[PDB]
Design a protein around this ligand. Structure first.
Ligand code: CHL
Ligand code: CHL
Ligand code: CHL
Ligand code: CLA
Ligand code: CLA
Ligand code: CLA
Ligand code: CLA
Ligand SMILES: CC1=C[C@H](O)CC(C)(C)[C@H]1/C=C/C(C)=C/C=C/C(C)=C/C=C/C=C(C)/C=C/C=C(C)/C=C/C1=C(C)C[C@H](O)CC1(C)C
Ligand SMILES: CC1=C[C@H](O)CC(C)(C)[C@H]1/C=C/C(C)=C/C=C/C(C)=C/C=C/C=C(C)/C=C/C=C(C)/C=C/C1=C(C)C[C@H](O)CC1(C)C
Ligand SMILES: CC1=C[C@H](O)CC(C)(C)[C@H]1/C=C/C(C)=C/C=C/C(C)=C/C=C/C=C(C)/C=C/C=C(C)/C=C/C1=C(C)C[C@H](O)CC1(C)C
Ligand SMILES: CC1=C[C@H](O)CC(C)(C)[C@H]1/C=C/C(C)=C/C=C/C(C)=C/C=C/C=C(C)/C=C/C=C(C)/C=C/C1=C(C)C[C@H](O)CC1(C)C
Lengths: 232, 220, 220
């Protein structure tokens, strides 16, 4: 066991995901990224082939959009996978598949959490919607403009009550966890786009889609649904 | 008296285009008719990226336009095509004999779409990365008009011929992109090939036009 | 209330002091500070987007009134072969064509091709004149020309001009929102807007949009 020495000698030997010598979205075929994607922000693989974020402030707003979409999409991926995953084990949901779980509010006994009548037992749609829009507006305006859990905090990484266990005290670990967050979230956004598309073309739950694929991968792939959207 | 460059170039609204042009749309780049009503290319760098997107979409749409029209022209010329129509030319892999190229069972005889897609993705990624940053056919050339091996005939060594062929390229390409959008929308609306759509329009021009399929997408 | 300057009304109300971009100065009508996407960071893209917003606003207001009027007049007693707006275009294919207010001798249009030709020719003329001027106006504002478009003269005072600008853009945003609603709920419901309001007033808790929520589920 030896004591690791401070970062005066070692300011950036670990900056693999930032700086000019950073991974890019085409690897060695990227060449050099645009002049504004310089590697200061997480997940910067130099992918701006459309130049939509050429302006710095539009780039900031797009970073905000991307990270918020990423967090919402991670929550959404886990929330579409978890009820179906536990519905494959014997937990009796009304509709464990995600693109049919919304209509559970039209059931006989209402929307039961974990299929349990003594749990939430929601019976109305627009009380759900009203409560949800009330609380979501409150907390989204808080995310926008201060609030009970932080006022002068950061826009995207406020911390404080949103970093209760203090995983962002180290700035190196913070810069690494930001890349981890944005990458897991881009993966979850891609996977939620997949959820949408392979729900539309297939109509089965994603975990059931995986079951069908691993039943016969050479047969049960997306090309088995290629002729479904043919004109007439 | 045509220029296709400079301040008095041909423009998108013709005579009513003198106050319709942004200050950044200098008559410098091919196809600059002054059409940026949405202001999407105010930044020169976004403008450059959009010009690259336009030219690549143009070339791909030209190749695709020729690839949609040619099999149908040859099938109406007599050769056997299991599925001549372009928007089901992909479903030939699931037939009994697979995708035969010109109807010959011993030209290509493709049976697996997954291996076709694998080799396509490999080759296409390689060539598009070479298009981005160079490779075996040009380490340091233009991202749009590299030349020097993509000119085995040598048409554009003069700057004036280069400019006029640039305009011709981008305009045939805009024509092909418009025609490809038409292919898409009127295949979805009609369900028949482009050549058969022209045949039906020539059969009865006042009857069988797009308005005959106008009440097709009403919810009801 | 101000509608202008730094302490103008904003799109999140009391929650809106820290979100507003630095470029959304309270200079232009309807500036509530809503540019979360940063799509108008460039002043020139911002100007083009303001023009697009105002033209969409005016066209959506005219269209909202044009979708509301014929149905009101339809139950008011007036015959309307097809009163609903999203099939008011299919009247050309009826036996008597598109008769304006049900009178057979008002318009009596039988050809959609000539109607569209008419429409394209003079819409192009008018929109080109809107772009760069013409018989009514050379060098006026691209958005608020005035002169011949103020026969009543409402906006000769700058303060009246500003407040009517805000009123215009806000009635127009209201009409654009309502037109998006028209579109989506015509596709979802298949009935007119007035009939949708009638059904919502007949049973507000049962006949709402959630009654058509499981309509687009794939189920395969
Ligand atoms: C007062 C109640 C309050 C509530 C219930 C929430 C609840 C939420 N905030 Mg939130 N916020 C609240 C106040 C505030 N927020 C923010 C700034 C943010 C940001 C920047 C983000 C959230 C996100 C969220 C969501 C994810 C929870 C989370 O971050 O777990 C983490 C901790 C677990 C223990 C959730 C809806 C995230 C989101 O919406 O993405 C899905 C998100 O990115 N909030 C500020 C400004 C400092 C607030 C001030 O009061
Ligand atoms: C002075 C007369 C003149 C007019 C009116 C126009 C008009 C136009 N030119 Mg232009 N030009 C004109 C002179 C000239 N042009 C050109 C060279 C070009 C080029 C190279 C191009 C144009 C293009 C355009 C179009 C750009 C605006 C647009 O996108 O339309 C937007 C408005 C519409 C499309 C309205 C369409 C009318 C119709 C009523 C729509 C039907 C409604 C549907 C039923 C609703 C849909 C239902 C839904 C729900 C499914 C527009 C049609 C561009 C183009 O082709 O874009 C299409 C283009 O690339 N022009 C030259 C040579 C120098 C001219 C010389 O005089
Ligand atoms: C402080 C409270 C307050 C809150 C929470 C809001 C909130 C809002 N204002 Mg604002 N305002 C508020 C105060 C004030 N506003 C205004 C004046 C305005 C104006 C003029 C405008 C707004 C607009 C907006 C919206 C902009 C964000 C958005 O687009 O939503 C995005 C989020 C949603 C739309 C979520 C919707 C909730 C719902 C759960 C969705 C349902 C999900 C579906 C079932 C899923 C779909 C299924 C698919 C697959 C088909 C938002 C709803 C703008 C607007 O109307 O845009 C719509 C607008 O033009 N406000 C004034 C006067 C000064 C206020 C004074 O206090
Ligand atoms: C974007 C995030 C998101 C959204 C919108 C939803 C939305 C939904 N979920 Mg999912 N879910 C998510 C993330 C998400 N989930 C994640 C990340 C997980 C993993 C922990 C789950 C695990 C999960 C299960 C296991 C179940 C749902 C269920 C539901 C539905 C009812 C919601 C409810 O009763 O909440 C209100 C309930 C609470 C806030 C907590 C419970 C209340 C306790 C008992 C009392 C507390 C006082 C609804 C369609 C239910 C359903 O019908 O499945 C189809 C259900 O049984 N979700
Ligand atoms: C990482 C995310 C992710 C994952 C794990 C999956 C996984 C799966 N998808 Mg989904 N999908 C995704 C993203 C994802 N998809 C996205 C983004 C789209 C929108 C384009 C789709 C659209 C889609 C459709 C339309 C269908 C599936 C289907 C499937 C299943 C069979 C695989 C298939 O047909 O490939 C199809 C794959 C795509 C259309 C695009 C995704 C490309 C992947 C993620 C990247 C390449 C990785 C891959 C291993 C290499 C392929 C190249 C190969 C030819 C050499 C499988 C469980 C099918 C199913 O349910 O079968 C039962 C099905 O019908 N997916
Ligand atoms: C230059 C390209 C081009 C050409 C040659 C054609 C040719 C044709 N199209 Mg296609 N089409 C095109 C572009 C083109 N289209 C584009 C860009 C779209 C998307 C808006 C469509 C969408 C479309 C649909 C949805 C349908 C057709 C149909 C047809 C056929 C009947 C004509 C018709 O209904 O016109 C429709 C034309 C359009 C909707 C837009 C094209 C705009 C043209 C090129 C400009 C106007 C030129 C015109 C001669 C002058 C004005 C005429 C006046 C009455 C207004 C005909 C073979 C119909 C078919 O299959 O019949 C057999 C049909 O159902 N087309
Ligand atoms: C201000 C404009 C406006 C007005 C007056 C209406 C009015 C109406 N709409 Mg339309 N609608 C609108 C905008 C509008 N809508 C927009 C912008 C959309 C696109 C998202 C839709 C999409 C839509 C669909 C898909 C359907 C309706 C339907 C209806 C009717 C039943 C109400 C309902 O289901 O609400 C649905 C409302 C929305 C989906 C969004 C509108 C948002 C409103 C204006 C803001 C919230 C105001 C509310 C009173 C306060 C919150 C309530 C709380 C429970 C959350 C009713 C006549 C239904 C119908 O035909 O029933 C007869 C129906 O099927 N609307
Ligand atoms: C980068 C770049 C570059 C260049 O320059 C240009 C370009 C190309 C343009 C670009 C790109 C872009 C892209 C790709 C994008 C994408 C996006 C996405 C996909 C998103 C998603 C996104 C997604 C998301 C949010 C998601 C979300 C989710 C959620 C909420 C969920 C919810 C839920 C759940 C749980 C389930 C239940 O039962 C129900 C519900 C209610 C449903
Ligand atoms: C802030 C804080 C603070 C303190 O300090 C600490 C704590 C508390 C820890 C924190 C929190 C956190 C959190 C909450 C997190 C979350 C996450 C998530 C949710 C993720 C997802 C994530 C997600 C993801 C990736 C997703 C992905 C997806 C995928 C791949 C998919 C795939 C697929 C698909 C498509 C479909 C098919 O058919 C099938 C499969 C195959 C299935
Ligand atoms: C200028 C301006 C101005 C202002 O400012 C603003 C705005 C208005 C925005 C602008 C406009 C724009 C526009 C109009 C655009 C358009 C585009 C398009 C149309 C594209 C296409 C595009 C197109 C394309 C790529 C195409 C391509 C094609 C291809 C690949 C093909 C393929 C194929 C074939 C052979 C057939 C077979 O069977 C199969 C497949 C496989 C299918
Ligand atoms: C602000 C902001 C901010 C951030 O930053 C970003 C974002 C978010 C992106 C943004 C937002 C935006 C939005 C929301 C937009 C919307 C729009 C609309 C809705 C339009 C409409 C629009 C609309 C419109 C034009 C309308 C129009 C109408 C019309 C013509 C009509 C016509 C007609 C009629 C009478 C009926 C009959 O039977 C026939 C017809 C022929 C059909």
């Amino acid at each position: 066991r030896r004591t690791v020495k401070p970062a005066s000698k070692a300011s950036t030997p670990d900056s693999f995901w930032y700086g000019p010598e950073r991974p890019l979205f085409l690897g060695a075929f990227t060449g050099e990224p645009p002049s504004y994607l310089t590697g200061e922000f997480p997940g910067d693989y130099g992918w701006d082939t459309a130049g939509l974020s050429a302006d710095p402030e539009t780039f900031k707003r797009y970073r905000e959009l991307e990270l918020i979409h990423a967090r919402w999409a991670m929550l959404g991926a886990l929330g579409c996978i978890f009820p179906e995953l536990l519905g494959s084990y014997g937990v009796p949901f009304g509709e464990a598949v995600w693109f049919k779980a919304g209509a559970q509010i039209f059931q006989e006994g209402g929307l039961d959490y974990l299929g349990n009548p003594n749990l939430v037992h929601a019976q109305s749609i627009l009380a759900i919607l009203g409560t949800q829009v009330l609380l979501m507006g409150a907390i989204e305006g808080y995310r926008v403009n201060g609030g009970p859990l932080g006022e002068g905090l950061d826009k995207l990484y406020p911390g404080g009550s949103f970093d209760p266990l203090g995983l962002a005290d180290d700035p190196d670990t913070f810069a690494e966890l930001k890349v981890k967050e944005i990458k897991n979230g881009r993966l979850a956004m891609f996977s939620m786009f997949g959820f949408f598309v392979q729900a539309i073309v297939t109509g089965k739950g994603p975990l059931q889609n995986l079951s069908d694929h691993l039943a016969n991968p050479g047969t049960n792939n997306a090309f088995a649904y290629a002729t479904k959207f043919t004109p007439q | 008296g045509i220029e296709f460059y400079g301040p008095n170039r041909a423009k998108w609204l013709g005579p009513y285009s003198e106050n319709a042009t942004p200050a950044y749309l200098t008559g410098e780049f091919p196809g600059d008719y002054g059409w940026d009503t949405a202001g999407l290319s105010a930044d020169p760098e976004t403008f450059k990226r959009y010009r690259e997107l336009e030219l690549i979409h143009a070339r791909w749409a030209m190749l695709g336009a020729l690839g949609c029209i040619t099999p149908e022209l040859l099938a109406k010329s007599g050769t056997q095509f299991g599925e001549a129509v372009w928007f089901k030319a992909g479903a030939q892999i699931f037939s009994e004999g697979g995708l035969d190229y010109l109807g010959n069972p011993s030209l290509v005889h493709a049976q697996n779409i997954v291996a076709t897609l694998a080799v396509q993705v490999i080759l296409m990624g390689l060539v598009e990365g070479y298009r981005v940053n160079g490779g075996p056919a040009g380490e340091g050339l233009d991202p749009l008009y590299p030349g020097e091996s993509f000119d085995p005939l040598g048409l554009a060594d003069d700057p004036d011929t280069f400019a006029e062929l640039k305009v011709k390229e981008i305009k045939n390409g805009r024509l092909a992109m418009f025609s490809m959008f038409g292919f898409f929308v009127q295949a979805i609306v009609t369900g028949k090939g482009p050549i058969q759509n022209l045949d039906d329009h020539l059969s009865n021009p006042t009857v069988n036009n797009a308005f005959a399929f106008a009440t097709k997408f009403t919810p009801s | 209330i101000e509608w202008y300057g730094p302490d103008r009304p904003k799109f999140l109300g009391p929650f809106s002091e820290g979100d507003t971009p630095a470029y959304l100065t309270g200079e232009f009508p309807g500036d509530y500070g809503w540019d979360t996407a940063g799509l108008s960071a460039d002043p020139e893209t911002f100007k083009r987007y303001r023009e697009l917003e105002l033209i969409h606003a005016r066209w959506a207001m005219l269209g909202a009134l044009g979708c509301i009027t014929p149905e009101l007049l339809a139950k008011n007693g007036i015959p309307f072969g097809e009163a609903v707006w999203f099939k008011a275009g299919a009247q050309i294919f009826a036996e008597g064509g598109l008769n304006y207010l049900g009178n057979e001798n008002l318009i009596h249009a039988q050809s959609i091709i000539a109607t569209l030709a008419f429409q394209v020719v003079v819409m192009g003329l008018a929109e080109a004149y809107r772009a760069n001027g013409g018989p009514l106006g050379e060098g006026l504002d691209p958005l608020h020309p005035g002169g011949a478009f103020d026969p009543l003269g409402l906006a000769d005072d700058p303060d009246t001009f500003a407040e009517l600008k805000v009123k215009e853009i806000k009635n127009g945003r209201l009409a654009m929102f309502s037109m998006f609603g028209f579109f989506v709920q015509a596709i979802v419901t298949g009935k007119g807007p007035i009939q949708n309001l009638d059904d919502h007033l007949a049973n507000p808790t049962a006949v709402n949009a959630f009654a058509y929520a499981t309509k687009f589920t794939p189920s395969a």
